Structure formats: structure tokens, C-alpha cells
């Protein structure tokens, strides 16, 4: 996260770290949506242009964390993966359309002060909150700058951007399964996700019921925190029928 700040303890208890077993390293962010399901970006697991195709046994998920590099004894919980599910129309060839994946854990994780699931949006919450200017929150352990790394989880609040401005900022084809967020050059505030934050959550606190909803997944960007560029996020609600199908079946 660029131009963010240190998270408070328990501020993002759904935040998940995707961790490579060997070499031991941070791969991506992710989020806890139930005691057995974790949501992330498909490109965190499958990206053939870079010879990335992780299997269940390659990875662990670490839940309840605050410190990036410490083993947080008696606080974090480490879970093995039962199965990965990647959206069948995830477009890794072109523009990362439908950049979403689910991971089912081998055993349920125990909730605690530090471990608790985020809600997924219904149609009405999405319609009400996914408006230009409305702010969401991005969290992660990714780099602090495009070109270093944080001691603890970072947090930044960023406004959703009008779709024409998103499109006009890039040569990439933007789809309805994406939205963009970030400040404009003239707005005098900054912030973005960066390397290591992708797959993590973009959340909004509903003013109707005071619950946190995951509206986006950190998907892609052109650099980090560049003037005139924006972060692009998977539109979780638009893909929720797939999420429900996977959980119902499996």
C-alpha cells in the first residue's frame, strides 16, 4: 500500500495473507468470507504469461495477522488449502476480466478478536454504495512504493472513480466486471495498492446496517500511485452468482 498508514489491531479481521510454502514468501492478499472460504484474485494463483500456476499444496493462508514477517504466536492461524476454484471465464490472456478465485480450507478456522469474516454485497448494497466519490478501504502488506516493505498491515481509503475517467486513464479494455478507485491529480491526496496487495479486499462500511462489505478485489494497476492512473478492482457483486454456485456445490 502506497501512502497509507498502519492498521489498528483488529481493524481488518477478514484480511488473509496468501503465503508460499517454499521459498517462504508473501504471494498476495485475500479475504475471509466464512469459516472455510477465502476469496482472492485469480491472477494470484494462475497467470500463465509468467509461468504462475499454483496448486493447493504450494500455498498456505495466514489469518488474523498484523505483522508482515513475524509468526504471530497465539494470534494468527495458518490453514492448508483443500481446493482452489478459478472463475471459468477469467481472462488472463487479455485484460484480467473476472479476476476472482475461491479457496476452500481443509478445516474451519476459529473466529477470534483478530479473525472474522467480511460480508459479500447484495444487489441493493452494491447499487447504493458503488458510486463515484464514495470511498472504500484497501488493506495489505504489499510494497510501500512502486520502486520498501511494511512492518505491519497498511490501510488506505480511496474514492471510487467515474467509469469514463477510469477508461480514459488506460489503453486496457475495461469491462463491467471492473471498477477503479483512487484520487485524481488535482485532488491533493494520494494512495494506491502495490505489489503484494493484489487479491486483497476493497471494503465499504454500509451506513444502513453498519456492517463491512467487500465490494472489490485488488486486481491490477499500471505502476503504483501514479498521477492520472487508478487502481482496478474486481466487481465482487457482478460475480456473486458464481461465488454462490461454487459454495453451494462444494
Amino acid at each position: 500500500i502506497v501512502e497509507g498508514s498502519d492498521a489498528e489491531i483488529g481493524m481488518s479481521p477478514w484480511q488473509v495473507m496468501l503465503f508460499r510454502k517454499s521459498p517462504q514468501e508473501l504471494l498476495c492478499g485475500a479475504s475471509l468470507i466464512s469459516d472455510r472460504w477465502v476469496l482472492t484474485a485469480a491472477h494470484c494463483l494462475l497467470y500463465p504469461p509468467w509461468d504462475k500456476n499454483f496448486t493447493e499444496n504450494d500455498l498456505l493462508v495466514r489469518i488474523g495477522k498484523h505483522s508482515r514477517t513475524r509468526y504471530e504466536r497465539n494470534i494468527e492461524k495458518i490453514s492448508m488449502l483443500e481446493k482452489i476454484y478459478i472463475h471459468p471465464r477469467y481472462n488472463w490472456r487479455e485484460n484480467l476480466d473476472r479476476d476472482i478465485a475461491l479457496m476452500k480450507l481443509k478445516k474451519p478456522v476459529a473466529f477470534s478478536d483478530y479473525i472474522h469474516p467480511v460480508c459479500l454485497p447484495d444487489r441493493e448494497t452494491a447499487a447504493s454504495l458503488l458510486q463515484a466519490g464514495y470511498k472504500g478501504r484497501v488493506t495489505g502488506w504489499g510494497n510501500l512504493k512502486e520502486t520498501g516493505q511494511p512492518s505491519v498491515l497498511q490501510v488506505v481509503n480511496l474514492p471510487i472513480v467515474e467509469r469514463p475517467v477510469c477508461k480514459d486513464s488506460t489503453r486496457i479494455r475495461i469491462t463491467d466486471n471492473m471498477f477503479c478507485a483512487g484520487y485524481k491529480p488535482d485532488e491533493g491526496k494520494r494512495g494506491d495498492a502495490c505489489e503484494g496487495d493484489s487479491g486483497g479486499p476493497f471494503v465499504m462500511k454500509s451506513p444502513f446496517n453498519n456492517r463491512w462489505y467487500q465490494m472489490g478485489i485488488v486486481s491490477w494497476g499500471e505502476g503504483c500511485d501514479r498521477d492520472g492512473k487508478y487502481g482496478f478492482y474486481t466487481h465482487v457483486f457482478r460475480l456473486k452468482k458464481w461465488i454462490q454456485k461454487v459454495i453451494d456445490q462444494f
Binding site: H116, P117, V118, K205, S206, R211
Partner: peptide, 28 residues
């Protein structure tokens, strides 16, 4: 899921984090 999105150290205790008000103020 019944309890989703309510943080033990914040909403469950009626404590606010240091920047959630920035979000609320944007929901105009």
C-alpha cells in the same frame, strides 16, 4: 455470515476506528 462484517474490536464493542468516519462522510 449472520455476524459478517461486524468486527469484535470495533462494531461489537461500539468503538470506531480512526478513519471509518472518512468513509461515512463520502456517502453523500
Amino acid at each position: 455470515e449472520a455476524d459478517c462484517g461486524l468486527r469484535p474490536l470495533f462494531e461489537k464493542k461500539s468503538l470506531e476506528d480512526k478513519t471509518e468516519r472518512e468513509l461515512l462522510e463520502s456517502y453523500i
